[PDB]
Amino acid sequence: DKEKINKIIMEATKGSRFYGNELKKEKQVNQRIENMMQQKAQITSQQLRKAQLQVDRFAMELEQSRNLSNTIVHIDMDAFYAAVEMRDNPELKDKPIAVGSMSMLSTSNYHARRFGVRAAMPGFIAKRLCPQLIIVPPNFDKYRAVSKEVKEILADYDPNFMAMSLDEAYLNITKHLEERQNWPEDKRRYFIKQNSVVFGTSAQEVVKEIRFRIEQKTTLTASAGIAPNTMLAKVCSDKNKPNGQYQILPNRQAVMDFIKDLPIRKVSGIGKVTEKMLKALGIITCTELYQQRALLSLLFSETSWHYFLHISLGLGSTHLTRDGERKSMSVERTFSEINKAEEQYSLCQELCSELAQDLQKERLKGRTVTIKLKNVNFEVKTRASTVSSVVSTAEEIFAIAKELLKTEIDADFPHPLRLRLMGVRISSFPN
Template identity: 65%
Template structure:
């Protein structure tokens, strides 16, 4: 007895899953029992039947667990859940937005209507678009027999033996959809298309503008009429012709508004929301000879429901007040709401919930039985709440393509189809300028078992070959898993996700290869830049508009050159406008680019491809192999190459007046504390030339002569934990230490390879303007105040006297 009851329950449950879903326009008043019986008889014994039966059993098990959980819920738990629901309801009510006017437009039997328009012989026949395996849509004549979308064609043939099935033609549908979207864009440029035949629009802004339009902007004629304005009169030129094909019973042969135009003059639309939507539908019919239905409501969820109220070729408006929304939602079946499918409908039905009003009454129970996301969604539905913000350009998470077919088990066909899918997906990615790191292969076998396999790559991919290389390996893995049996498929799809963001697309740092290559400069262009008239360097007046493209750094530098710096009282700079109002780092970088362009010699033609420059010894290494090049750098860093040079050491033998360093400005009497600029030299010592020597972290071998003979320097180094005296032999030439480093700010060559000294010099260069601003001094152009190179060899800064 128990077994029979279980079987009966399973059969009833299966019927509910396989039963016809008549929650669609044009399917009211059908004989459901007869249709469901035909569906059952046609499906029994098929793999689809077995798969649906297995899914139904899984759903029944979920319901059993849910009912068992419900039996253990206490009154205290219900009270606590009810308090939580009431608090959230109060918060949602305070945030209810009824100010927007959202429209959902849905074309009537779109694919079927396009085929009927192009083939009038189908107008009075039940027809569907698709194949014997699956239908995409059906016209309203076929819906009277229970034929609908997502139904196998062979079952539809048993429901309606005279059904005409037309193959799909998506190129044609996309072309018509583009025409419809042109009309949408006139009412909301940021409309949200959901598919080829439906979209959401926010016409709130359009209605504000519409109220100020003259009546002439609200007048429309059919394509066979021309609007001729002559002395203020509208003249009729050609008779009116019917537009819309007969897609359903009682469909008018032409638009009602065109009948008025034929009888008199033209159709004039109003300025309210209903009139704006009627005008939109009128224009769609004029442009495509197809009809559309629309729903008008305060949010997207309600607009979707409203668009189905007066289908086909109609519209419905829900007033934007709370009571109207609550009254509308009370008796609405839960299955009518987008997002509630047959599984959720059955689980709610087991709790006695069939309408949206029941959702509100049992919300505390739902909060205990369903996930937080689910019961929050149910609460929004019970209150008639939905999104009021149409976001078309939201962040895309993935992009995919898939194809359903008859049984396919040949390896050659499977790999060929995989490549075709990758090619189609690569084209879609190219259109959207997207690249992704994760490639997923979706497979459905003949038993309707779905498997997905994904692989995440270290870099983003987008081309056909890149996608196919990954998808092919994933497909091989599945083939090997079922070996020696063949992999029998009926669906295959490829998806790309983990898209690279805008920041990821930009390299975080320059490639080491690009950095080590010598930069090629155009000497002619450099010469042209340097000889431009001064007036071209002056910044434009603030009133003039700047070009859309960002100016180059060289252009920014030119704008700075032509504007003089005038010191004023208190050390405040005056006379700086426009592009001169930049940070010091921006100006310093522009200045370094200018100096580099003026001083850098063009490299040899073969240097770019045949050699790399060592960042340690700055020599050309005749190789493009990074392994060889890295080995050379390792040798330089370990000191292997320091004894291989035989240059003279005349440049090391310099007098006291040529200590190594950089000359910033002329000697000033302004005493600026080091702490004011963030500098804290360990030791300051007066140099013979009147400047100040800075010895923090200095390698003794980089100073004049032998630093061991200078007790002051030696004490500084030892007290600060700096480098200890080196025991290596005394170098014979300057090249033993490697070529000098060049400051990226002032472009002056520094006769040292000690990075501590070099970094200190760069810090001072970067802070020189700050020092002068604090001291009330006018900055001085380095190109006119630098001493000869021979005087820059020491670590002496004669420009500013630092005091601690």
């Protein structure tokens, strides 16, 4: 159980340098919360009243603009990496496995997820939650191929769909539903790998068709979420996981019912921290997020409480925007400790090289270079430089990064930098 999990994790992790840095970060967020409470205390019923008035005017503007006509779907491959590793090695099918290394786990099967073993967890810890664990190395190109197959299926229903990662996507199947209402039985017929099955004309049905085709073509299961906007769809896709779906019917009441007791943590954008801060105000669900809208208008910036309000009303994008041009590119690498300056400069040079190579791949030229440095106590710092003309080759990037690094090395003199990670990043591309 949770007690046993947190117990052995803590027992095996206590007093590490990582653990220390986590205590530091925890302390800092606690501080942020302290400040926010002290700022809550100086709020008068008056300015609060004015707040509630303005906020409600805006909210009215929102609820007026609500759109329910579109059908939005979110597909999420189940335990992806691990599912693929299981598909092609049946000697694992009934065992707890994780895709990753000893350092870090990309993911785990549900069979192992029952031991608290999860993504973003170090391997050696996961093997202490579960010593019978099989850690199988990742085969990224396979995952990309399967991804291609799945996207091929998805393009049938929404050509202009939006792929998140290798295993996630949003589809706008309004057009398809429209054209599918008057579809003969033989455009909805698929063969099991003459032996057929047929699918209906409802959204629910379109989605089980897609999931079916995916299982046939790839031998892998996916979950899906069906809702009138992206936010809602994304929350849906996780309810009936794995290999299941869920629809929110396009009526305001359904939206509100689904929302009213939805934990804020489950919406995309609200992580551990924001959850803790909102929990400090006694906000856990979206109902309470709606109630305290004015208070939030006074406590948070315009962007944050606007967002919070959208969430609390169940709004979200209903139009999938074309995957835009990128805004940054970066390479970073973790290694066992590096003290010697010349080696650090060399490392920098190499990273800059790879970066110049990637920029070359996309023909990109930018004028802001940032170096990233993570020391052995896990403290991270970045340093940037924006220059007049755009930059592209390994020589230029190294020219800048070299002197940023120089600056840090000198700044710490006569001490050596004790690095565990190093990165170089470029941005400020043209318009």
